[PDB]
Amino acid sequence: TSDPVRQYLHEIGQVPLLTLEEEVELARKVEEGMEAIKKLSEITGLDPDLIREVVRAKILGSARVLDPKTVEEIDQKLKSLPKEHKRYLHIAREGEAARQHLIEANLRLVVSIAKKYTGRGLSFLDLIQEGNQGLIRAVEKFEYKRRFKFSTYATWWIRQAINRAIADQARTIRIPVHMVETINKLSRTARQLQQELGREPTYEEIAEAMGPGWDAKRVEETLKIAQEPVSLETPIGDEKDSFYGDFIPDEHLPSPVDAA
Amino acid sequence: KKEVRKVRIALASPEKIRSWSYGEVEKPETINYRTLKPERDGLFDERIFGPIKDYECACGKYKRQRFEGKVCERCGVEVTKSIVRRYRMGHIELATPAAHIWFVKDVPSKIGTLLDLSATELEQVLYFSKYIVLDPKGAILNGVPVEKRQLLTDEEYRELRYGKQETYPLPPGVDALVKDGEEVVKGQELAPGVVSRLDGVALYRFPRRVRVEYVTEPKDYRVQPHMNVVVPEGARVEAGDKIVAAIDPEEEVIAEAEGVVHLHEPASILVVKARVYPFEDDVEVSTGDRVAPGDVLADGGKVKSDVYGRVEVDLVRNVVRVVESYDIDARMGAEAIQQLLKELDLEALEKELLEEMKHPSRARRAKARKRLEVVRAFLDSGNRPEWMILEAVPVLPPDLRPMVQVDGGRFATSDLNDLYRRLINRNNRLKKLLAQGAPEIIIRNEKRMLQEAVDALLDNGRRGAPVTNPGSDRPLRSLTDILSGKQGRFRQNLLGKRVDYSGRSVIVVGPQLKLHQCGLPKRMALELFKPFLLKKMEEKGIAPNVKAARRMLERQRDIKDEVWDALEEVIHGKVVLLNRAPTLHRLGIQAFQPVLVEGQSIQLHPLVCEAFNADFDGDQMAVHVPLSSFAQAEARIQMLSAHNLLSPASGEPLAKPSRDIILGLYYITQVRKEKKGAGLEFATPEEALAAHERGEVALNAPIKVAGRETSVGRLKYVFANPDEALLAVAHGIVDLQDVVTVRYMGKRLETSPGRILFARIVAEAVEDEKVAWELIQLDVPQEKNSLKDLVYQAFLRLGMEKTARLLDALKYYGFTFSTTSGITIGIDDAVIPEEKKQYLEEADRKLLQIEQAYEMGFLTDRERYDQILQLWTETTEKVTQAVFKNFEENYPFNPLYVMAQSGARGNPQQIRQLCGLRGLMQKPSGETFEVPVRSSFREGLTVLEYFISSHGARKGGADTALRTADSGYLTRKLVDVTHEIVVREADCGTTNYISVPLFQPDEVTRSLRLRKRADIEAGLYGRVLAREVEVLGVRLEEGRYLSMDDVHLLIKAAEAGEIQEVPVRSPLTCQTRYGVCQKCYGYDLSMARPVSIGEAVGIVAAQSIGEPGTQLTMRTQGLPRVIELFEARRPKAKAVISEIDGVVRIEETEEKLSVFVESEGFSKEYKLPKEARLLVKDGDYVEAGQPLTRGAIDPHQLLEAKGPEAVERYLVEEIQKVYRAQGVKLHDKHIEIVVRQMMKYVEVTDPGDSRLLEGQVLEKWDVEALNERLIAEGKTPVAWKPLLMGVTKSALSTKSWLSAASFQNTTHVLTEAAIAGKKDELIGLKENVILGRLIPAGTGSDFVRFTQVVDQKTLKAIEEA
DNA sequence: ATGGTTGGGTATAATGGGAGTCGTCTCGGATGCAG
DNA sequence: CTGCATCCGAGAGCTGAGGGAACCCAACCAT
Ligand SMILES: [Mg+2]
Ligand SMILES: [Mg+2]
Ligand SMILES: [Zn+2]
Ligand SMILES: [Zn+2]
């Protein structure tokens, strides 16, 4: 009942994986499906994204609630197209279904990669969902002509997605990705210097070890801006009755003496 | 501005939430990390919530007033007061609906009752574990058709929605025993080692080899995993055409000539259950479309579907395959729950349950009634059930979840910000995933996480592991956590606040103060009365203006002398409130006139220490300053210390002499007794005088002269008046303790100068000689009880001002005479009697005997143990008697003896421990030791006795530690259940009454014995006589208030057999709504006069009951008994009572015992444990409700048997038993009020011609009014039975949702009130306190608060006009 | 005119996680048993 | 269809003072 991680893992396990034949088949179907989508777009003269939306609606079915009238109208506006030029539509439908099977079968790469990213301010489930987002991007952009396995192209996208999610959602005050990476470099340099020298390093040593463009003053500012707000309800004293926020005065509103 | 009169709470619609919000929060950003300004579309954006600065937009275009209502074009921020940042909300638009956890997890779930779903099913559906069926569309599951509101697991749905498509991996290089595309029945082998288990066609997947003929001869081609086969099975090929298309130009397989194609050694087989349809032209339905029977597929309609399923056009073989499936519509989560909720028709459901209410089954009727309760609440309130499902989630204003910069430059934030950030992140990710057409597993997981995030925001730590911030184990505090608990909003900021114009300091004895005065340090007074001091200094020439006065008073060294005189003039006539925590009764806060003193300590009058329960070993007290004229008038008239002299609980004096005062008065009022003469006989007084002069007889020896007893003191010293006697005392002729003859009030009194001096002190204090002579008891030493009686009589006879004067005079003279009395404590003053030694030896004798009687078999271990305990107990009692007899006979003025006898300090047990011996001690297991402590504290203990006594000391300490908390909890519950009871009218007009008995059944049922005088006083004093009484030729008329003298008169008449019970009015039979009346309550015990209309008697009663429980009551017995009685818990030592009348016939067998009660109509049986004890005898008659075993009676069974009155009397008597056991005086009125609140509800047995339901609990008054209207209209009256519920459940069932929500179980009360749309009418006191209004009690009562005042001149002028 | 910011890409293969709690009592629904 | 009868989960237990874990790459907007 509880512990949603176990439920998610069981649901993922209920889907079987693929073999090499299955993987190459699905990838080839996906490729011909996108090619057929582009061919149908050229044939009808419409914008590709709209026909893509129509195909997605048809695969997902009425179950997935863009409105029924438009998608139905254009669906029959494509049935008007003559034969021989119609196989493409069936190929696009098959390719969309193939994308669905490929994603469901390869979801396990997300958990396998993400299980070693816990403890960075994001829970496991958020990491996993962001990894599925990277997996969809990898699936859509995959080219099977290189004869490379899906895992090779998927892992890079998964790591990129997880790392971007860490940079964007790990802190209450949003700090840009480049500055988060800079803080990451500062922390790793500081811990390495501490390990080699055997004591807590000074700011000047870290700045010298970073290289040109880095002084002690900028290092202090960088450590300053990396600080995270504290909780107003931090328990003070032995008894559970005194909080930190209970000792914070208002300096904005005028006092009764000032108003008088 | 209209006055606020009611507060309504109801469910909020999505439209209401969207109208509240000033904009949608689309981003999880809080503030910018560079500029510390709110981020656009973030949680702090000024366009939504308002500007940070007053009348200034974000971009600075407008920085002045008059732009109210104008929104800056560049920044979008309105120009207005910044305070709007604590009022304006935002909202988040959920991609998918989410369920409000309050209506899901409060057992029983509201959604579960509405949708007739259990908690497990609701949890499974809401949290994405099972499907629920909507519009089944004629689907078949296991041969049974599926119906609405049916729960399917994932497996059944996948089978129904898609089908069965099993796959078998055939080993590489093995041919299959079947061909591609032929129907295979279950069990038909598809390979030498693979056997199918479902009916349907088998489909080849990646055949390993291909045999291609050529026009003939065959040829073989290997098919590698990296390549695919294009030509369909059984299709001819042409020359030059391709068969195995390849990625690499050299790897392509082009057919050389024309030949057929066959595929062998399939890598896998896919068996499905489906139908097949060939076509030779364009098709109409594409892959992923679902079709019905008789639909066009291809060939312009030549081919037609026969079954329901999903169509997929396999182009490789150019064949349409329809897999058998259905279009069933099953949805998950709060979206599905909302869809089910909107289809609900409440009127038809109400009719269905009304029909169900005719079932013979009682359990079915109860369940249907429970469903009808919620259904009718929804129908009456007008709320829609779908509003219990959230679509837009409101966002609290930022100023109530602040992100602030601490003084050290760091940032501090609320947990609500993190919860909102998590919710926003999950919502945005869900929107992105939905926009991408992600597979359904990812979407389901995303929806589950969004639901969990909403649950954490609403109630974190309720389902599953609570959400915590990384690096800590502390759960985040959700809005409910803010609302509820001991630290929540209601209990911490609404029922109690921190206040201005207040201080605190240590207290010091103030013996030179008057009764109405308190010593206040100069610095405290200067700080507390600062604005008044500034204004008064402005009046004088000390400062030109208030600012100059403030700067001058700012620095300590800048203060002068005249400012102190200005302060002294400021506080002239004003009073302050002194308070010592814990405040157990109303006397814990009292008003005093401040006298300015030096130093840092508050000076307290000695006579209020008992009322405050304050000592001088480090206690601190707080001081408050009432500001306005109304507050000062209330403090001076109703809260003055000198105006509160009697206890509100018992009516006995509470401000009375104590400790040293009694010691001094007793020392000066005690008379000497000597043994030198020892009853010698003298014939003429002159002989006695000569004998005394020679030195043969003592001055105060009780001699006999001429046949009458006297002393030499009486004959030798005859004084004309008290002045001469006191002058002789001043010259050392006689002492204050000598007995002489004095002429006073025209009589010759044989008394001592000390008693005459005491009489003169009292007479000069009360300024009345005759009344003072009447009040005092001359012929006894003055001790605690006599002084208390004197104070009470003086109050009654003269008034509180003269009583205060008398108290002050008594205090002063007691202190003065205690100073010079010569009271001291030395080690030799604890005289150990000689008899003790003998008493010990005798014990040491019997011990030996006992041992003999144990060594010869006459006694067992248990008997010997009991005999040792009995002997040592009797020895201890005998030692006590010997100690006190020795003290009285040899050392009548011993300090310990005087302290114990006068009541100043100490009890006989402590004196016995000091002198004789400590005695028996208890082990931690509760059983006594075998050896006693034979040493007193004077002799000095050994190590072993000290160690054994440590057990009892520690147990007493721990007992105290738990008792104080339990008594505080009980007091809070009583205050909360009785808080609404006020005296609201002069007379309710009732004719009901109660009969207080004067005789109680004897413990052996021999006869009725007269109750103790204290109990009769506590049950009769101050009450209103319900009926006329004739006793001893005295006619007590109806409506008379019973004073103490009348109570004594009735007790005397009862002792003469003229009366057995007294009929009196009581709150138990009062008919006033939401309170009592003046006549049914009686006296205000603190004034000995009829209670004033408007008094909050419920709070007084609750405090009065709760006060003694802390410490006074120790701990079936003690405080647990009181707690069990006030909560109406069924006792674990429950006894057996008779539900009906009859005669008793005890039937005992060698294995079992039973009692049969045989009436004239029916004969019932009672089976009871053999170990039990029976209070009955064979062949006696017992009434209904009489006990047949010893133990506590279950109140509900007594209510069923006898009725309400018997339970009322039982509860009152049993609650008073515990307090009387401890010696605590407490009037029956308070317990009677509490019991009246306890029995406030009834249960409907037959609704008759009303809209009520059977079994619906409701207030008695409402059903009585409904019955009255119904009989007036001529319908069938409702039939009801009384109910009894504990104080907690009675308090939680009140009409006012504010008080119930602030009491306990906040979520349940709030959800019920919101569903019902309850309106709070602000009848009680707590709601008005929460709203910051004037309570409907005291000066805020409607009876008195509209009074006007005017002089005669203005009244005459208005008359002329 | 200038830095700091914003989004996109990386190709051997990589495919179900991990932490854990114990010396409390009382009250009201919920489930399963005999009659 | 009653009645017992455990069986489990939920929600409480004095006040006050005081408590202190990647790198690169290249475009793009605010000011
Ligand atoms: Mg003390
Ligand atoms: Mg004389
Ligand atoms: Zn602006
Ligand atoms: Zn009345």
- The span from the CA of A113 to the CA of A128, in Å, is 9
Neighbours of ion ligand 4 (CB under 5 A): B 988, 1070, 1077, 1080
Residue type, B286: S
Across the A/B interface, how many CB contacts are shorter than 8 Å?
A: 154
| Length of chain B as a residue count | 1361
The whole-angstrom distance between B630's CA and the closest CA on chain A is: 22
Q: Which nucleotides of D are covered by protein (CB under 7 A)?
A: 1-3, 10-25
CATH number 2.40.40.20 is the correct assignment for the domain at B498-520+574-643: yes
d(CA B433, C1' C5) / Å: 26
DSSP secondary structure, B402-416, as one string = -EEE-TTS-EEE-HH
DSSP secondary structure, A207-253, as one string = HHHH-TT--HHHHHHHHHHT--PEETT-EESSSTTEESGGG----SS
- The span from the CA of B716 to the CA of B736, in Å, is 16
Q: Is B631 helix (H, G, I), strand (E, B) or coil?
A: helix
Report in angstroms the alpha-carbon separations of B1350 from B633, B1091, B1345, B1353.
18, 27, 15, 9
Calculate ∠ Cα B137-B143-B149, nearest 5°.
Answer: 45
In sequence order, which residues have a C-beta less than 8 Å from that of residue B835 and are 6 or more positions away? B879, B882, B886
In sequence order, which residues have a C-beta less than 8 Å from that of residue B1030 and are 6 or more positions away? B1036
- The span from the CA of B741 to the CA of B749, in Å, is 6
Q: What's the maximum distance between 2 C-alpha atoms anywhere in chain A?
A: 89
With tokens 């002089």, the residue in question is B1351
- The span from the CA of B1216 to the CA of B1210, in Å, is 10
Distance B662 CA to ligand 2 centre (A): 32
Burial class (CB in 10 A: 0-12, 13-18, 19+), A96: buried
Q: In terms of CATH, what superfamily is B993-1065?
A: Molybdopterin biosynthesis moea protein, domain 2 (3.90.105.10)
- The span from the CA of B183 to the CA of B272, in Å, is 9
Cis peptide before B108 (omega within 30 of 0): yes
Cβ within 8 Å, pair B225-A232: no
- What letter does residue B2 receive in the DSSP assignment? P
Pairing of strands B1153-1158, B1142-1148: antiparallel
Partner residue facing A93 (CB), from B287, B442, B452? B287
φ, ψ of residue A86 in degrees (nearest 5): -100, -25
- Residue B135 annotated as part of some ligand binding site: no
The whole-angstrom distance between B521's CA and the closest CA on chain A is: 25
In sequence order, which residues have a C-beta less than 8 Å from that of residue B900 and are 6 or more positions away? B906, B907, B908, B911
Q: Are B759 and B776 in contact (CB under 8 A)?
A: yes
- The span from the CA of B678 to the CA of B680, in Å, is 6
Neighbouring-strand partners of residue B519 = B595, B603
Residue type, B412: A
Q: Are B193 and B177 in contact (CB under 8 A)?
A: no
Q: Do B824-940 and B993-1065 share a fold?
A: no
Partner residue facing A121 (CB), from B438, B470, B550? B470
- The span from the CA of B57 to the CA of B304, in Å, is 70
Identify from B222, B316, B441 which residue to disrupt to test chain A contact, counting A C-beta atoms within 10 A and taking the largest count.
B441
With tokens 């302050």, the residue in question is B576
DSSP secondary structure, B126-144, as one string = HTTSSEEEES--S-EETTE
Q: Please, how many CA atoms are within 13 Å of residue B398, restricted to the half-sphere of its CB? A: 23
Which of the listed CATH numbers 1.10.3720.10, 3.40.920.10, 1.10.40.90, 1.20.58.760 matches domain B521-573?
1.10.40.90
Quote the tokens at residue B492.
């911490």
Quote the tokens at residue B1076.
């009592």
For residue B31, give the nearest of B500, B350, B404 by alpha carbon: B404
Measuring from the CA of residue A175 to each C1' atom, give the nucleotide at the shortest distance: C5
- What letter does residue B209 receive in the DSSP assignment? E
- The span from the CA of B1045 to the CA of B1033, in Å, is 15
Residue type, B1287: V
- The span from the CA of B107 to the CA of B114, in Å, is 13
Calculate ∠ Cα B746-B750-B752, nearest 5°.
Answer: 105
CATH code, B1135-1191: 2.40.50.100
Residue B866's H or E segment, with its range, is helix B861-890
DSSP collapsed to 3 states, B705-728 = ECCEEECHHHHHCEECCHHHHHHH
- What letter does residue A186 receive in the DSSP assignment? H
Burial class (CB in 10 A: 0-12, 13-18, 19+), B539: exposed
For residue B197, give the nearest of B156, B168, B154, B155 by alpha carbon: B168
User: Helices B753-766 and B784-798, interaxial angle, to 10°?
Assistant: 30
Quote the tokens at residue A244.
């930190």
- Residue B617 annotated as part of some ligand binding site: yes
d(CA B1133, C1' D6) / Å: 20
Neighbouring-strand partners of residue B404 = B412
In sequence order, which residues have a C-beta less than 8 Å from that of residue B1233 and are 6 or more positions away? B978, B981, B1067, B1076, B1097, B1098, B1101
Report in angstroms the alpha-carbon separations of B1182 from B361, B441, B1179, B1188.
36, 74, 10, 9
Neighbouring CB atoms inside 10 A of A44's CB total 16
- What letter does residue B1190 receive in the DSSP assignment? S
User: Helices B440-459 and B333-343, interaxial angle, to 10°?
Assistant: 80
- What letter does residue B492 receive in the DSSP assignment? I
Distance B716 CA to ligand 2 centre (A): 4
- Which residues in A lie closer than 8 A to residue B298 (C-beta atoms)? none
DSSP secondary structure, B976-987, as one string = HHHTT-EEEES-
Report in angstroms the alpha-carbon separations of B689 from B376, B683, B713, B1236.
101, 11, 9, 72
For residue B325, give the nearest of B202, B200, B225 by alpha carbon: B200
Quote the tokens at residue B648.
């509100």
- Which residues in A lie closer than 8 A to residue B289 (C-beta atoms)? 58
Please tell me the class of the B1346-1361 domain: special
Method of elucidation: cryo-EM
- The span from the CA of B688 to the CA of B707, in Å, is 13
A139: nearest CA partner in chain B: B438
Give me the architecture of the B272-325 domain, per CATH.
Answer: Beta Barrel (2.40)
Q: Is B1083 helix (H, G, I), strand (E, B) or coil?
A: strand
Residue type, B647: S
For residue B1072, give the nearest of B975, B992, B996, B1127 by alpha carbon: B992
- Which residues in A lie closer than 8 A to residue B128 (C-beta atoms)? 7
- Which residues in B lie closer than 8 A to residue A252 (C-beta atoms)? 82
- The alpha helices in B540-594, defined as continuous H runs, are 546-554, 562-570
- The span from the CA of B207 to the CA of B175, in Å, is 9
Q: Are B966 and B974 in contact (CB under 8 A)?
A: no
The whole-angstrom distance between A191's CA and the closest CA on chain B is: 19
Please tell me the class of the B824-940 domain: mainly alpha
Quote the tokens at residue B1034.
């005295």
Residues followed by a break in chain B (C to N exceeding 2.5 Å) are 215, 1115
Report in angstroms the alpha-carbon separations of B887 from B383, B672, B677, B825, B840.
81, 14, 21, 15, 19
Quote the tokens at residue A141.
């952009």
In sequence order, which residues have a C-beta less than 8 Å from that of residue B844 and are 6 or more positions away? none
With tokens 């002050």, the residue in question is B808
- The span from the CA of B975 to the CA of B969, in Å, is 10
Which of the listed CATH numbers 3.30.1490.100, 1.10.274.100, 1.10.1040.10, 3.30.360.10 matches domain B644-823?
1.10.274.100
In sequence order, which residues have a C-beta less than 8 Å from that of residue A242 and are 6 or more positions away? A235, A236
Pairing of strands B1034-1036, B183-184: unpaired
For residue B1296, give the nearest of B1341, B1337, B1330 by alpha carbon: B1330
Q: Is A125 helix (H, G, I), strand (E, B) or coil?
A: helix
Closest alpha carbon to C1' of D19, residue: A237
Q: What's the maximum distance between 2 C-alpha atoms anywhere in chain B?
A: 176
Cβ within 8 Å, pair B446-A129: yes
Sign of the alpha-carbon torsion through B773, B778, B781, B786: negative
d(CA A181, C1' D23) / Å: 10
- The span from the CA of B277 to the CA of B284, in Å, is 13
Partner residue facing A11 (CB), from B402, B412, B441? B441
Measuring from the CA of residue A180 to each C1' atom, give the nucleotide at the shortest distance: D22
A54: nearest CA partner in chain B: B437
> CA torsion, points A219, A220, A225, A230, in degrees to nearest 10?
130
Neighbouring CB atoms inside 10 A of B505's CB total 17
Phi-psi category of residue B135: left, alpha or beta, with phi > 0 → left and psi -120 to 50 → alpha: left
Measuring from the CA of residue B968 to each C1' atom, give the nucleotide at the shortest distance: D14
For residue B911, give the nearest of B921, B897, B893 by alpha carbon: B897
In sequence order, which residues have a C-beta less than 8 Å from that of residue B528 and are 6 or more positions away? B501, B502, B503, B576, B623, B625
Cis peptide before B582 (omega within 30 of 0): yes
Which residues in chain A, range 183-222, keep a C-beta under 7 Å from any nucleic strand D atom? Answer: 183-185, 187-188
Residue type, B68: E
Q: Are B1093 and B988 in contact (CB under 8 A)?
A: no
DSSP secondary structure, B666-706, as one string = HHHH------SS-S-EESSHHHHHHHHHHTSS-TT--EEET
Neighbouring-strand partners of residue B323 = B274, B310
- What letter does residue B285 receive in the DSSP assignment? S
φ, ψ of residue A70 in degrees (nearest 5): -60, -50
Cβ within 8 Å, pair B267-A21: yes
Residue B771's H or E segment, with its range, is helix B769-775
With tokens 């328990």, the residue in question is A235
- State the fold for domain B1241-1284: Wheat Germ Agglutinin (Isolectin 2); domain 1 (3.30.60)
- The span from the CA of A70 to the CA of A49, in Å, is 14
In sequence order, which residues have a C-beta less than 8 Å from that of residue B1232 and are 6 or more positions away? B1066, B1067, B1068, B1208, B1212
In chain A, the N- to C-terminal Cα span, in Å, equals 61
Report in angstroms the alpha-carbon separations of B1233 from A145, A146, B1227, B1236.
90, 90, 11, 5
Quote the tokens at residue B882.
């010997």
Residue type, B1069: T
Cβ within 8 Å, pair B413-A97: no
Q: Is B542 helix (H, G, I), strand (E, B) or coil?
A: coil
Quote the tokens at residue B356.
């169900």
| Length of chain A as a residue count | 260
- Residue B915 annotated as part of some ligand binding site: no
Residue B253's H or E segment, with its range, is strand B253-254
DSSP secondary structure, B1127-1175, as one string = TTPPPTT---B-SS-EEEEEEE-SS-EEEEEE-SS-EEEEEE-TTS--S
Calculate ∠ Cα B749-B750-B754, nearest 5°.
Answer: 90
- Ligand with minimal distance to B507 CA: 1
- A26-31 LR contacts (CB < 8 Å, sep 24+): A26/A98, A26/A101, A26/A102, A27/A102, A27/A142, A27/A144, A27/A150, A28/A144, A28/B228, A29/A91, A29/A94, A29/A95, A29/A98, A30/A95, A30/A98, A30/A99, A30/A102, A30/A139, A30/A142, A30/A144, A31/A95, A31/A143, A31/A144, A31/A145
The whole-angstrom distance between B184's CA and the closest CA on chain A is: 24
- The span from the CA of B1064 to the CA of B1048, in Å, is 16
Quote the tokens at residue B235.
């299709």
- The span from the CA of B541 to the CA of B534, in Å, is 11
d(CA A14, C1' C15) / Å: 13
The whole-angstrom distance between B151's CA and the closest CA on chain A is: 16
Residue B1134 Cβ under 7 A from any strand D atom: no
Q: What's the distance, CA B1145 to chain centroid?
A: 47
Neighbouring-strand partners of residue B620 = B506
d(CA A165, C1' D21) / Å: 14
For residue B1108, give the nearest of B1015, B1230, B1195, B1021 by alpha carbon: B1230
Neighbouring CB atoms inside 10 A of A93's CB total 21
Neighbouring-strand partners of residue B394 = B91
- The alpha helices in chain A, defined as continuous H runs, are 4-13, 20-44, 48-60, 68-79, 87-114, 124-141, 150-169, 177-197, 203-210, 216-225, 256-259
Q: Is B579 helix (H, G, I), strand (E, B) or coil?
A: strand
